């Protein structure tokens, strides 16, 4: 999640006074192309190199991509709510989510760099195949980056991240 | 101080069984997978398969597919795989291990047990 | 499924000679391990994620690669680095070892 490696370059940025979605390219300064659903939507030359969304009041959302002068950057899908993609559903205060590869190997999950639905000593967090289930969503605590991954690989190796924020 | 004791060997006759151990210490049971490795005399390594212990998630090596069978207690920390309908073919030594993810390897190896099937 | 081939099969070196073994995977791995094993006991997690040498593994022991082409580097052979090396994949389901490369010492 916090590490570019893998291609994952495109991040969120993580420091706005106003509620507005900022999206960055790790890639080498000097003119940002930048994609959305495979589609351009934007070319920064030179100065600025951020990628404004909008105010994360609009629920932006899609694949997102960038590109300096080597190849495109592995998506980052957003989702907010305030190439087969993670599948969100959202009912009441439970949010679940669904691995987008699943050969039904062992699917594991990773939020910010850390793991998660694997210990049963967690009633709100719970692990169902290539479903991820959390109860009692906590907007500020558990809104961030999300992977799956089979057991064996790295999750850099994943196709591309899912960056979550809800507010339920 | 990770330790896998592995059962002693074993003889079984063809078309029988056999269910052979693995008790674990020096790290918690629980969180991670453990695999089984198969090794000829005078042969390489073959993947079995693993279990999780967690909940008793378990994936196999297809040409293993119901002839082994992986199975743990976590009270007593201990793996088990039994072999099934023997022949020839299975005598081997088998291997118990556990996989590090975070070193995406079997770091910590058991003795490994010796069986024999024959009449 | 993944198939590593490893070369070569087998292999004999003086002391202070630098031996390289190989590891070729059948389709990309991302990263490559490997085991070491002496006559008579379990294989001993050796070099694992590529490149990083266990504890307690000779330093003059190198790991590397990318892709299909992996090695195991030996900068000085010693008495002791006589043995069995199994290469081993998990990127792709199912788990697999290499056939493995046997290392003997000259003298």
């Known amino acids: 999640m916090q590490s570019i490696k893998g291609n994952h370059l495109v991040k969120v940025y993580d420091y706005q006074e106003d509620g507005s979605v900022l999206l960055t390219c790790d890639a080498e300064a000097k003119n940002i192309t930048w994609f959305k659903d495979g589609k351009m939507i934007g070319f920064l030359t030179e100065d600025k190199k951020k990628w404004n969304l909008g105010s994360n009041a609009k629920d932006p959302r899609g694949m997102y991509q960038c590109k300096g002068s080597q190849n495109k950057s592995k998506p980052l899908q957003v989702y907010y709510r305030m190439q087969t993609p993670y599948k969100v559903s959202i009912s009441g205060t439970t949010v679940i989510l669904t691995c987008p590869q699943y050969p039904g190997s062992e699917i594991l999950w990773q939020h910010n760099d850390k793991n998660i639905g694997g210990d049963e000593d967690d009633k709100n967090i719970g692990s169902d195949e290539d479903h991820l289930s959390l109860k009692e969503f906590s907007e500020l605590e558990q809104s961030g980056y999300y992977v799956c991954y089979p057991r064996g690989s790295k999750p850099e190796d994943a196709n591309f991240y899912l960056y979550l924020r809800a507010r339920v | 101080q990770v330790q896998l004791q592995q059962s002693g060997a074993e003889l079984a006759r063809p078309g029988a069984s056999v269910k052979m151990s693995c008790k674990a210490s020096g790290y918690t049971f629980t969180r991670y997978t453990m695999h089984w490795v198969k090794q000829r005399p005078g042969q390489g390594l073959e993947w079995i398969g693993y279990?999780?212990?967690?909940?008793?998630?378990?994936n196999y090596n297809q040409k293993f597919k119901d002839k082994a069978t992986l199975t743990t207690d976590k009270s007593s920390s201990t793996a088990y795989m039994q072999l099934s309908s023997l022949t020839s073919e299975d005598s081997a030594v088998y291997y118990c291990?556990?996989?590090?993810?975070?070193?995406?390897?079997?770091?910590?190896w058991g003795q490994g047990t010796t069986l024999t099937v024959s009449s | 499924q993944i198939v590593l081939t490893q070369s070569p099969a087998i292999m004999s070196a003086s002391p202070g000679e630098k031996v390289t073994m190989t590891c070729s995977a059948s389709?990309?791995?991302?990263?490559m391990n490997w085991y070491q094993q002496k006559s008579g006991t379990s294989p001993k997690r050796w070099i694992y994620?590529?490149?990083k040498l266990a504890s307690g593994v000779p330093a003059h022991f190198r790991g590397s690669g990318s892709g299909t082409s992996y090695s195991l580097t030996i900068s000085g052979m010693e008495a002791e680095d006589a043995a069995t090396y199994y290469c081993?994949?998990?990127?792709?389901?199912?788990?697999?070892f290499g056939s493995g490369t046997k290392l003997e010492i000259n003298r």
């Open positions: 389709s990309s791995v991302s990263y």
């Open positions: 994620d590529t490149s």
């Open positions: 081993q994949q998990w990127s792709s389901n199912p788990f697999t």
């Open positions: 279990i999780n212990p967690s909940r008793g998630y378990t």
């Open positions: 291990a556990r996989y590090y993810d975070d070193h995406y390897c079997l770091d910590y």
